[PDB]
Every structure is written in structure tokens, then in C-alpha cells.
């Protein structure tokens, strides 16, 4: 039972249980059913809350369909993984991640006038190794001026702070001039394209290093989990996993009437069907109706 | 794929590269007389110029049937490829069963023989736990929720430190 | 029975999606 705002998110979605709900909804609209009125109310706080809790319903079936490139050599499966995350973010309603984190920056420090409270209100959304390297530059400009350097653009203190911050940015490894000349725009399409290609080269290396860092975290977690598991004798492993499986079954079995409980138990029935169907003919895979 | 593709009978592969399957076409004006041989079965048919264009009309859309999910199966495949790297060094364990005879029992120190039998039981423990392969599907669900809540971001699923740092330069170094 | 479907078998199984649906159903009327 789709609620006319959930189905508007699943129209461009490409996973299974959302598209099946859309197909049932569109076959309902084929059999002479009216579409509900889309509600033009619920001022912007509830709007962004519904967007936040509705793009998660498109992201969460979409992450579990995206295979990690674990243990792979090369930047081609890492780029496959980051591209699938990009297509998932675009299906769920997000924009480019550059644009979305710039929007988070502009939404965070819209009412801050000093650079120090910009660095203290965008603290979570930047790395600590970069926030410290900006805080020391800000402290040096505070030693040079002995007055709070304001975040205006026409204030000259911000200019002599940014002239060091560009050197900080290029010494971190990211070309600040290429990024600024992309996101400012250019005169003709040739000198705009000449910096668009270089910003997309940096951006490709940026999200590829991001996905590679995520995959190295999952690889280290899998190695630590296995090396802690291979130190146990087998009976301890079997009783621990039967205890975990039974306790997480009964955590869904006590709660009854909800959608996630029946979906969990229908999924356990589907997993047991998969084990039976691979038992019936194991050299040909599971039986799919075709 | 897109809705309009433009491939077929034009800069196409006309001959095979493998000795296991032997394909050959007849590049005529419009049509093509193919002949394909894969072992003792043979097929030699004819495809029209407007017959490969309608091949990409219906889309295949290959999608995977997994036991739990493609994420969980990829994590479990990695855990199995780690179990193999442990198992390959349990494969190089020196054969202690050649020294079980009583001409090594009564020649050796009592404490060194107790140490040796403890080492053999330790090998049997390591080998019986590295080949508990059905526990990998439960270990792989101890990586799934932390990762899947990492991708449940308020910003973007594909976000990371480098993109946010580059856009923090773009936010800071532009005016206000 | 056996040979279920393909679009029924493309579902990622133990994904959340419904704890999210439960919170979005018990939060949005109560925050409105």
C-alpha cells in the first residue's frame, strides 16, 4: 500500500520491491482508479524531513544490491562501485555529491560571520586533518591582526587568509584553482571545457579515493572478524552463531503486526527456499521461472 | 542501455578468435549469412540488416539472484577468499603423523612428546575451524549493518573526505 | 512452489527499508 509520496520516489528507482509496488500501482491506475491529490502543505521542515526519511527507503534497498569490490586489484571495480553509488544517489533524489555537500555547507553556516565559527560549525563535514590545518592558519591570521577575521569577501583579512588557505589546499593535494574555476564558470565553452575536464579528473580521483578508502575499511574489518573467528574452536563458533541467529529471530518474532517483522520472517522463508532450491539441483543454480 | 542503440553488421566481428567455437559470416550488401560451429552441433542461418537493429528493442536487464543480497554475497566471497589464504598455509603444515610411531615415543623427552601431541591437536583445531565454511555467511552479517548505516548518509551515499574537502575549499575560498 | 519468479528473487533480503518505513510512518503524522 503506497502512500502517493512513497510511490513518487520509486518511479525512477530500479530495485525490485519498489518497482514491483510501482507496477502494482500502475496496474491499479490502468483499471480506472484515480490518483490521490499531491499535498501542497507541510512547510519546509516537514518537507526536508520527508525527503530525508524517504530517500533512505530508496538508498537502503539500493546499497544491498551494490556489490563491494573487495579484494580487487585495479581502479576499475572501485570506479564501478562509486558509479553505482552515484546512480543510487541520483535515483534516491540526491544531486552530485559535490553539490550536496556544498549545499550542506551553505545550509550549516548561513548565519555565521567569522571564519572561526564557520570552521566550528562545519566541523563534522570536514576531516580533522584538514580542520586542524585550517585552524592553525586561522590562528596565525589572528596573531597577525589581533581581531576576529570576518567571513565577508570584501574584508582584506579574509583575502590574506585565503591566500594561505589556497596553499594549504594544494599542499593537501587538491587543486583549488581548478575547483574554483569550475564552480565559478568561464567565458566561452572552450576555456570552460578546459577546466571542466580537469575538475572531472580531480573529482573522479576524489570519489575513487573515497570508495577505495571505504573498501579498505571493509577489508580490514573482514580480516579482523575472520582472524578473531579462526581462533575459536568449532563448537564455540557453532553455539555462538546459533545463539545469535535464534536471538535475532525472536527479536522479530515477539513484535507482531508490524511490516518489518513479517518482512523479516518472509525473508527467512525465502532464504530457506533458496537453500532447498539449491539442494534440489546444485550444478544449475536456483530454480527461476522462465 | 539506452533506448536507441546503433550496432549491427557495421564494423562487426566477422570471424572467431578461439579454436573452441568457430563462427563465420558472409558480409554481403545488406544481409549476412552466418555459420557458427561449437563442437558437433552446427548453425548456419541468415540475419537481415534490420534484424540486428530490433535486437536491442527489448532489454535483457541482467539482474542477480542472491541468497541474501549482492552486498552480503560480495562480503562473503571476500571472507572465503581470506579463508583460502589461511587454508593455503595450513596446507604447508609438516606431516606430524610420520612421527607418531613408538620409535619416536621412547626416544624423546616426555615433555617434548607432550608438546608434540599438543601441537598435533592444535593443528586439528585450526584445520577444523578454517573449514567451517558455513560460518562465513554469519560473519558477513557482522560487516553489513555498520557499512549499510555508513551509506545511509544525510549528505550522499557516495560522499567521503576528499570530495567534502574539495568542496570545502570551493565553499571557503569563494566569497562568503 | 519451485521456480518462483525473477522479480521476486531480485529483492535484497535483510535490508532495512521497513524500519525506515516504520519510523517514517510513526514520525511524520506525529511531527505534523
Amino acid at each position: 500500500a503506497v502512500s502517493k509520496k512513497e510511490v513518487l520516489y520509486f518511479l525512477s528507482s530500479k530495485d525490485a520491491e519498489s518497482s514491483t509496488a510501482v507496477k502494482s500501482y500502475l496496474k491499479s491506475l490502468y483499471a480506472g482508479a484515480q490518483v490521490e491529490a499531491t499535498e501542497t502543505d507541510a512547510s519546509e521542515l516537514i518537507a526536508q524531513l520527508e525527503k530525508k526519511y524517504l530517500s533512505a527507503q530508496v538508498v537502503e534497498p539500493g546499497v544491498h544490491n551494490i556489490a563491494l569490490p573487495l579484494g580487487e586489484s585495479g581502479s576499475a571495480p572501485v570506479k564501478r562501485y562509486a558509479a553505482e553509488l552515484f546512480n543510487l544517489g541520483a535515483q534516491a533524489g540526491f544531486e552530485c555529491p559535490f553539490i550536496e555537500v556544498s549545499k550542506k555547507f551553505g545550509q550549516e553556516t548561513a548565519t555565521s560571520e567569522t571564519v572561526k565559527d564557520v570552521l566550528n560549525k562545519t566541523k563534522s563535514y570536514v576531516s580533522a586533518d584538514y580542520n586542524a590545518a585550517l585552524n592553525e592558519v586561522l590562528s596565525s591570521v589572528e596573531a597577525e591582526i589581533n581581531g576576529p577575521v570576518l567571513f565577508d569577501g570584501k574584508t582584506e583579512g579574509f583575502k590574506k587568509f585565503a591566500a594561505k588557505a589556497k596553499a594549504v589546499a594544494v599542499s593537501r593535494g587538491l587543486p583549488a584553482d581548478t575547483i574554483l574555476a569550475y564552480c565559478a564558470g568561464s567565458a566561452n565553452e572552450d576555456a570552460a571545457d578546459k577546466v571542466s575536464k580537469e575538475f572531472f579528473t580531480w573529482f573522479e580521483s576524489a570519489y575513487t579515493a573515497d570508495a577505495a578508502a571505504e573498501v579498505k575499511a571493509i577489508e580490514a574489518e573482514a580480516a579482523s572478524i575472520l582472524d578473531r573467528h579462526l581462533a575459536k574452536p568449532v563448537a564455540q563458533i557453532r553455539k555462538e552463531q546459533a545463539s545469535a541467529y535464534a536471538s535475532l529471530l525472536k527479536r522479530a518474532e515477539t513484535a507482531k503486526g508490524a511490516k518489518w517483522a513479517e518482512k523479516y520472517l518472509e525473508d527467512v522463508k525465502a532464504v530457506q527456499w533458496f537453500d532447498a532450491s539449491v539442494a534440489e539441483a546444485p550444478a544449475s543454480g536456483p530454480k527461476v521461472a522462465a | 542501455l539506452t533506448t536507441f542503440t546503433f550496432s549491427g553488421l557495421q564494423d562487426a566481428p566477422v570471424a572467431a578468435l578461439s579454436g573452441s567455437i568457430k563462427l563465420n559470416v558472409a558480409a554481403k550488401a545488406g544481409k549476412a549469412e552466418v555459420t557458427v560451429a561449437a563442437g558437433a552441433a552446427k548453425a548456419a542461418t541468415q540475419v537481415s540488416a534490420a534484424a540486428l537493429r530490433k535486437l536491442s528493442g527489448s532489454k535483457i536487464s541482467l539482474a542477480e539472484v542472491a541468497r541474501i543480497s549482492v552486498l552480503h554475497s560480495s562480503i562473503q566471497n571476500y571472507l572465503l577468499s581470506l579463508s583460502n589464504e589461511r587454508y593455503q598455509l595450513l596446507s604447508q603444515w609438516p606431516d606430524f603423523t610420520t612421527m607418531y610411531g613408538k620409535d619416536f615415543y621412547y626416544r624423546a623427552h616426555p615433555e617434548d612428546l607432550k608438546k608434540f601431541y599438543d601441537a598435533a591437536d592444535e593443528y586439528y583445531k585450526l584445520y577444523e575451524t578454517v573449514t567451517e565454511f558455513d560460518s562465513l555467511s554469519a560473519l558477513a552479517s557482522q560487516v553489513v549493518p555498520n557499512y549499510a548505516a555508513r551509506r545511509r548518509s544525510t549528505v550522499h551515499p557516495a560522499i567521503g573526505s576528499t570530495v567534502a574537502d574539495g568542496a570545502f575549499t570551493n565553499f571557503l575560498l569563494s566569497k562568503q | 512452489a519451485d521456480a518462483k519468479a525473477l522479480d521476486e528473487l531480485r529483492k535484497p533480503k535483510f535490508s532495512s527499508k521497513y524500519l525506515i518505513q516504520h519510523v517514517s510512518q510513526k514520525l511524520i503524522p506525529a511531527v505534523k
Partner: peptide
């Protein structure tokens, strides 16, 4: 094989905390 369902969001953007290498290869070679 089944996992605890979590419903929480990650607001901060951190480096993903690459964990330490365990000693299992060294201990089994020993």
C-alpha cells in the same frame, strides 16, 4: 546469517577507520 536491522543516519563525514592488522598470519607461521 540474519543481521540486526538498524534505522539510523550518519550525519558526520569521517574517514572510515581502517582497523589494525591482526596477528593470525604471524601466529600460525609461528
Amino acid at each position: 546469517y540474519l543481521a540486526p536491522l538498524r534505522s539510523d543516519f550518519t550525519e558526520e563525514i569521517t574517514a572510515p577507520k581502517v582497523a589494525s592488522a591482526s596477528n593470525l598470519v604471524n601466529e600460525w607461521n609461528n
